[PDB]
Amino acid sequence: KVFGRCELAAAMKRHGLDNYRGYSLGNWVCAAKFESNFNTQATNRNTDGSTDYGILQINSRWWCNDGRTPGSRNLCNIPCSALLSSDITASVNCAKKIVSDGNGMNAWVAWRNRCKGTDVQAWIRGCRL
């Protein structure tokens, strides 16, 4: 699924991501934009042989099992394929674990490089939430 901006904003809020670990909804929508362009089916191979899955590009190195990331972990206890679903429940659940790991949303390098410190509220502008 390619979510609309406000569509994804509404979904993230429903699943309790708005102000989770103190990160406003605009922060999460911005990370999704630059990680996946709001595409649930987005997959990207990392230089280390791990892969990034779904709207928030969750890495197989730590968080989900894809069977081809040697010496990895599955801390969200889910197949990475679950993270490509049109239903973002699994992605959100797992993102909550990631953002709680101690570096907040810096875990998403695209959030650090493209969202952090910016006017993230723009991403929820015009949305009925």
Q: Considering the rule CB under 5 A, would residue 59 count as an interface residue with Na ion?
A: no
Which letter, b or e, does each residue of 16-44 get, where b requires 16 or more Cβ atoms within 10 Å of its Cβ? ebbebeebbbbbbbbbbbebbebebebbe
Range in contact with Na ion (rule: CB under 5 A) among 26-34, 53-61, 92-100, 119-127: 53-61
Q: Is-catalytic flag, 52?
A: yes
Cβ at position 36, least distance to Na ion in Å: 19
Residue 18 annotated as lining a ligand binding site: no
Nearest Cα residue to 34 out of 94, 100, 105: 105
Question: Does the active-site annotation cover 7?
Answer: no
Catalytic residues: 35, 52
Binding interface with Na ion (CB under 5 A): 60, 65, 69, 72
